[PDB]
Structure 1
Amino acid sequence: NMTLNFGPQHPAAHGVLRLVLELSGEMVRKCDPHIGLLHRGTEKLIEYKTYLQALPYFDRLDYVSMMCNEQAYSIAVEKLLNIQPPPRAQWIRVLFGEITRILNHIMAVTTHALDIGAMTPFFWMFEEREKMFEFYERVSGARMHAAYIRPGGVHQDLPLGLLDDIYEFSKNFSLRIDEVEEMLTNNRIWRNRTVDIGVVTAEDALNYGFSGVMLRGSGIQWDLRKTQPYDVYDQVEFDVPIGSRGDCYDRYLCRVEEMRQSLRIIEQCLNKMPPGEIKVDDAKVSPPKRAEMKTSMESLIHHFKLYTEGYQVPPGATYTAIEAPKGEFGVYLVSDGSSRPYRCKIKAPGFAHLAGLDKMSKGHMLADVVAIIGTQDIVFGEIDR
């Protein structure tokens, strides 16, 4: 049983993963993934920071999916305060929530192929990604790591003109997904390296807490967005892409299908986004508008206290989970009455998925392990936190 460290710096291994492996022949006898090569303290650091200054940590937890993560903390802090965002902000979060799902899937499908050896899909879709980033930048200011979705709504209304461009792009992106397809969905070779690799049973997927496409790929029907609606994902209409004969190829097809379904959700959001405000009107939770803080005393006091001290969330604890592109992203945020949190365990769709690597890659070749790490969309930020 030859032992070998897949290696932190592996061109294939996403980020840095030391996958100590015992390989009988080329077959992988045992898979003991090592983690923490990217532990950084995100959970302890948050205890020493106020709610609004811990929002930027969430973007960094799994930064492929920059915003969708922010929505989970937002929702969580809103629940604890029993405040809910204004109607326009909700649609925004679903608009950028979905755009972000595409961004993650373009990452997951194209990076999967680069490790497999197909390199042209990545360049094709990274150009589309690029175009999306620009939406982020023109809405938040940052290409990624925006900090746009804050605990009481979004930070600033969309620029005057973004919606139109999030249309032109959406109107075309489909063809770009279609192309990748003509390149990989039916390749006589993609199928082989992906089909019947890492099959996970339905009962086993629920047991190991997979909770993501990984469950959906095995045929279990669960989309937290339809089962437990958050924001206004209830008012839209989309089809969860369930899969059968769950294997690397089937789940892939599912991720390409949610890229397709997210364009259906984005279209609607553009078609039906309401006129209104983008942040709660409670100066108590949301910072006062700058014209107001510069002309009204109560607004300055509320601006000064909010930025310097904080929300002062009422004491309680909540586990709120959304459907981040990877899977169920949840924040268990225990909170004392103080302005700074007490605990914030981030449930990472990924801590559970990696664990499954062992029960998925059994009697498999070195190349199979590379394919399976891809079909779990492992971003070491969320796993290591």
Structure 2
Amino acid sequence: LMIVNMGPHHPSMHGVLRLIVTLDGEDVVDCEPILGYLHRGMEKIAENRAIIQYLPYVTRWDYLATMFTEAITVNGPEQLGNIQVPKRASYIRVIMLELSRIASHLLWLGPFMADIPFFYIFREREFVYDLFEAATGMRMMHNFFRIGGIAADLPYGWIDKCLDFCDYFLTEVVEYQKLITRNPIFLERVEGVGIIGGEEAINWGLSGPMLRASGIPWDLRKIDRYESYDEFEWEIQWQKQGDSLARYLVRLSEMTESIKIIQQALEGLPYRFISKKPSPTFELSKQELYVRVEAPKGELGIFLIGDQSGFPWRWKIRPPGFINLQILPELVKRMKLADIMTILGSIDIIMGEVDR
């Protein structure tokens, strides 16, 4: 039972974490995940900062998809103050949020395919960041979410590049879909892990790909009527093969479902930039409001107890992947050191929203 140190510079690059295991032989049997490495103290500083000052702070959580964090932390005060967002800016927010979900799943499967290369996905990623530069102007550090919608307007080149992104992107996606059917090393090196079912993934804490891996059509934005999700084409992954390749088909189907949503929303266009802007500064109320949104990892959440002041009295975040990190102590029991790379890939986690 030689204790692994599981150091800060991992052989893989998926964050800094601590997974000391007794490993009797090569079989890992007992996990003790030590965290606190990439920690900032978001809650106390968010109690010490306003919404327009913790609004630059929402970038250090799920920075592979930064639209979700600022999206839920601006959708908090919109439903809190009951201020209506017009349909145009809300649908463009839906388009860019699904594009960030696309970016999150491809930036998962990039380094996951690198561990188990970079320019096989970067040919797409250069045009993806060109879309981010034509949408807001930054690469992943955007500050463009207001109460009335997008802080700016879409330029006349970004809608043309958004029309071109579908037949720029879906063809290389379906050229990348056949690899797992062709290449048997993904049928023999990541096949098998992920043995949890649906009645158990509901039982512990799970959401996102680990909950849709068992063949459950789970969606917050389908159950909760949000952003007119029943107008668009939906196909939530009811893939019941359980394992890690079931999760890969889950993520391919989620990317293709977002492609279908954006492709139906290419020519929608139902309406200004910011509705209800009389003054630059405002405040918040005091309610008992827990707002959540469909994360790419499953139910990102914002807890809020107001102060009727410039600062929020309570600001607690429920990150999706940190609740999804609880299941590995149970998914460690009968695997190998060559398996834990596939495990910490298939969790689909970065340490930005973990410690926070």
Same fold (TM over 0.5): yes
Residue 234 of structure 1 and its aligned partner are, at CA, apart by 3.7
Matched, 1:235 2:231: yes
CA contact (8 A) 2:148 2:276 kept: no
Aligned partner letter, 1:50: A
Identify the residue that residue 99 of structure 1 maps to in structure 2.
99
List runs of 5+ in structure 1 lacking aligned partners.
284-301
Give the distance between the partners of 2:192 and 2:144, measured in 1 at CA: 41
Evaluate the alpha carbon distance shift between residue 367 and residue 64 of structure 1 in structure 2; reply closer, same or farther with a 3 A threshold: same
Instruction: Give the superposed CA RMSD.
Output: 1.5
Give the distance between the partners of 2:316 and 2:97, measured in 1 at CA: 22
Higher alpha-carbon deviation: 122-131 or 375-384: 122-131
Identify the residue that residue 306 of structure 2 maps to in structure 1.
335
CA contact (8 A) 2:38 2:355 kept: yes
CA contact (8 A) 1:321 1:331 kept: yes
CA contact (8 A) 2:233 2:257 kept: no
Aligned partner letter, 1:156: A
Matched, 1:190 2:186: yes
Q: Where in structure 1 do 4 or more consecutive aligned residues deviate above 6 Å?
A: none
List runs of 5+ in structure 2 lacking aligned partners.
none
Higher alpha-carbon deviation: 247-256 or 147-156: 147-156
Identify the residue that residue 278 of structure 1 maps to in structure 2.
273
Aligned partner letter, 2:274: K
Give the distance between the partners of 1:323 and 1:380, measured in 2 at CA: 19
Residue 13 of structure 1 and its aligned partner are, at CA, apart by 5.0
CA contact (8 A) 2:301 2:318 kept: yes
Give the distance between the partners of 1:356 and 1:96, measured in 2 at CA: 31
Identify the residue that residue 214 of structure 2 maps to in structure 1.
218
Residue 378 of structure 1 and its aligned partner are, at CA, apart by 0.6
Larger % of helix: which? 1
Give the distance between the partners of 1:93 and 1:140, measured in 2 at CA: 12
Pairwise mapping of residues 1-385 of structure 1 onto structure 2 (< 5 A)? 1-116=1-116, 120=117, 122-274=118-270, 276-283=271-278, 302-303=279-280, 306=281, 311-385=282-356
Aligned residues: 356
Residue 229 of structure 1 and its aligned partner are, at CA, apart by 3.1
Higher alpha-carbon deviation: 89-98 or 187-196: 187-196
CA contact (8 A) 2:134 2:157 kept: no
CA contact (8 A) 1:353 1:376 kept: yes
Equivalent position SS for 1:220: coil
Give the distance between the partners of 1:152 and 1:244, measured in 2 at CA: 40
Give the distance between the partners of 1:126 and 1:228, measured in 2 at CA: 35
Equivalent position SS for 1:19: strand
Identify the residue that residue 299 of structure 1 maps to in structure 2.
none
Give the distance between the partners of 1:152 and 1:54, measured in 2 at CA: 18
CA contact (8 A) 2:13 2:111 kept: no
Aligned partner letter, 1:26: E
Identify the residue that residue 286 of structure 1 maps to in structure 2.
none
Equivalent position SS for 1:91: helix
CA contact (8 A) 1:67 1:147 kept: no
Residue 282 of structure 1 and its aligned partner are, at CA, apart by 4.2
Residue 152 of structure 1 and its aligned partner are, at CA, apart by 3.4
Residue 24 of structure 1 and its aligned partner are, at CA, apart by 1.5
Give the distance between the partners of 2:228 and 2:315, measured in 1 at CA: 25
Give the distance between the partners of 1:216 and 1:8, measured in 2 at CA: 31
Residue 59 of structure 1 and its aligned partner are, at CA, apart by 2.6
Higher alpha-carbon deviation: 142-151 or 247-256: 142-151
Evaluate the alpha carbon distance shift between residue 152 and residue 109 of structure 1 in structure 2; reply closer, same or farther with a 3 A threshold: same
Aligned partner letter, 1:163: I
Aligned partner letter, 1:278: F
Equivalent position SS for 2:31: strand
Give the distance between the partners of 1:166 and 1:15, measured in 2 at CA: 32
